[PDB]
Symmetry: C5
Subunit: 236 residues, 5 copies
């Protein structure tokens, strides 16, 4: 990592292995859901201002051999010449995104600019290597658990959209689509009530979550139910 | 994070992911009990002096997509014009609480002031987004376990008040209310003795905990009880 | 935390949450055994030179709501006027141990002195709030386990003295008392041999541990015992 | 560790034990698979710029007594005289790779050069001590699990090549070899389809993984299968 | 801890509790095997350059009350007068190894020298307090497990020599002794083959480990064995 020191000069320190392994362990593999690690790495590329060697550790630690390779070739394919167009000219490709340690000096504007570009291309590589295969069955398979809160269920449903479709569940144009899955795949008592809401067309995803919470939050405690049964006094 | 360097100049460093994940893992979700994370974030906003990007990591890591959205809209709704009144004027709202990365420079008084305001609005957003649904049954359901100390039980009871009522269990005006729940929901031997205390009306919550501890601390060890039984010598 | 920077100026940084949670998780609650956390906090108050806000995080993280309250009132009760005597004068109490954030500036001798006093009073508060209820049965209940080394058993026995009696097991005047519990509550083979030691009155606690280790260290391996049995050749 | 300070002077700090133990715990032992720890140490030797004492902690923590010994003798065997040839002259060997703490001062070009050489020789020692015994059966024993993704299986297969053969599975000359193992040892449905691919000779390892993913990603959900069975309506 | 700052001045920071607890948790107790913690503390005394208070935390965290006491008295017994001989003169003993916080100022050569001596005496104290009781049965009880590699077994065997004998298993004069235990206590197939090696007297401990690995590495996979059995075709 690099940071601007108190003396106006960049200062280097290696990644703590705890950060690298924490990032790995708190995310799905790149293959499972490329968006996760891509977003994490995009962030780190900014906050940690990694050098070329730092980037090798990032990639080497978070990606498998086969994933890293895909990303690196995708990054080299993203290089542009001075005319803003793709280039497969070895010298240009190598200069932008070197596969072997470059002589970039972070204390120089020249070194810094190469680092900026390298990081940008690395990100591009990951974005393009991503392309997670679609599988709508995975989205239909997200069903609210009997103890699962509506907001927790919605987050799992959105994660499935991200991983297994090309649709961003946060896009305004996807709201009715996510809303319909949310209603259909909520726990049955909740889904039946959401379906019956007055002016259903007018409900945002946030509205639906709040309405589902009212039903969920009306969970009718096990103890309460048992007490009712006891006080049933209806025999057979 | 930002801190005043030894040279009188602000110094930046990114959050350690271990801190972010520790904060997440040691607290309930925002939806479960908004007070928990809100108080943690209020503290961090001060001690860590986060930039706008840092705040995005905080929110992005500690809140779900749906929670973050609620908070961000609530924060924008908290923006005030120069006349101290609410404003929905896009330029004013955007200038105070930008949804996209602003050009705020922390080395400038201008940048610092925007950061201060941003953090204040973020906190407001969380406070207002909170509004955890009420559920008195949850408070009545907190019952002292057979091995649970009176002070540990009281902390669980207060946590239920915080999460599932609008009442602050630490307010002086709530003391008799919390006291009555504490007496009623203590383990039966303890509750019966607390109920019989002389000048019960005069007992603070702290007094009641100390009296319950005397009974609890009189637990009559299992070994002791067994020994007594053995030395029973009373046959049938 | 504060530390003297390389430039001769105090430098501030917030507590890592990992430290706070580690301190919490590696100790009993304050109520269970006040000495543990009190000693930890006394140490931290020195090494970490916490500000008033830092102290709020310490207390807020390591103590329950009810424990913190006890400590804070005990700290305010420990305030002394300029005549070295207790004072309940609101302005004096508030000035020494404020319940709300004070304007103390650590870059000023004035601020530093208030911080020193605050920390001293905080410690006093914890020491006085402590007063763990006595329970001799807990001390008598510490019995050496069949696999437990004599030194490990002695440490558990001393911990019970600390938590459940007013006697410090490290005091020279308590040595024979701890020694007698150690002999009586050691594993039976060990206790019978320690009781038979020549010049028993002359044995220190350290001597007794070493003598018990000789017996323990003569554990007669399970394998060895089994082998002996096999080579028994005595039939019925 | 050493790093260039903000003042243009090297700065020393000891390894955090968390890093050392994390490195140990996230890798196989040196004996099991020398490549793992060798690559980790090669990286650290650069990013952390360890002193001679730091190197002793690295080795002492990551290697067993017997492994460290092998490495140290291998490192001393890698020393070269000024004529670029091996030397077993005690003074030359001792000067390059001392077994006891040297007087190297990192603030001097002399000290720095010795440190550079020491680290280079340490790496050489590890590389040469490596020589993991071959065992082709271990490579043939890597079979894709019923829930295991093709990319995860390929990474396990490559790990076995690294640990139990002298062949680098990333070498271009090994691609058909790894490809054949990948096809043969994939789950049976996948392997049969990969074997039937048109222009199979033209498929890279990456192509084969993508083709296997299409089959795997066609997993035919358990729920789906069950539903089909239910709707079977074919009785006996 | 202390370190030389970038400004040529010592800089202080308290131990992270994570380091202290990691050191504790990754080692046997002092009583179990004094060598472990003694070596760890000897290292830390150098890399972390602890003050007197830091040393109290080290000892207080890594040793039990009874162990620390032994160490402290042993350290005071190691103090030497200006004539290089032992001294029990209170003032000399107290000046070298104070039991209560001394006024040592690390910014002074006087303070630094006392710190150096204190650390040296602390180490001496631990070395002398060590003296782990002998128990040859423990060494004979180290037997290679059926899945245990020869190098892993040898490390466990050496650990038993360290903990339960006065012999250093790394001494050149102990090699044949450790070698004989290694051969005798290896898994039976391995031990029988090592015993039959040509020029056995000439085999180093490293040679024996490599020969045992050849046999172990010839483990004859369970799958392989099963396959052989199946293809047995010999019926009864």
């Amino acid at each position: 990592p690099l940071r601007m020191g108190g003396n106006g000069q960049l200062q280097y320190w290696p990644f703590s292995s705890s950060d690298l392994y924490n990032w790995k362990n708190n995310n799905p593999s790149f293959s499972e859901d490329p968006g996760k690690l891509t977003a994490l790495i995009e962030s780190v590329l900014t906050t940690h201002q990694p050098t070329w060697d730092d980037c090798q550790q990032l990639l080497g630690t978070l990606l498998t051999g086969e994933e890293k390779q895909r990303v690196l070739l995708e990054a080299r394919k993203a290089v542009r010449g001075n005319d803003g167009r793709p280039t497969q000219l070895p010298n240009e490709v190598d200069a932008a995104f070197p596969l072997e340690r470059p002589d970039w000096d972070y204390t120089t504007q020249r070194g810094r600019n190469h680092l900026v570009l390298y990081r940008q291309l690395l990100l591009a590589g990951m974005q393009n290597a991503g392309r997670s295969p679609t599988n709508l069955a995975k989205v239909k398979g997200i069903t609210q658990g009997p103890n699962e809160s509506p907001s927790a269920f919605l987050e799992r449903l959105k994660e499935a959209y991200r991983r297994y479709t090309p649709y961003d569940p946060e896009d305004p144009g996807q709201e009715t689509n996510v809303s319909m899955s949310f209603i259909w795949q909520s726990a049955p008592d909740i889904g039946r009530k959401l379906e019956r809401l007055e002016d259903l067309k007018s409900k945002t995803l946030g509205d639906l979550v709040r309405e589902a919470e009212k039903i969920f939050n009306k969970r009718e405690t096990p103890e309460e139910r048992e007490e009712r049964i006891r006080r049933e006094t209806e025999e057979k």
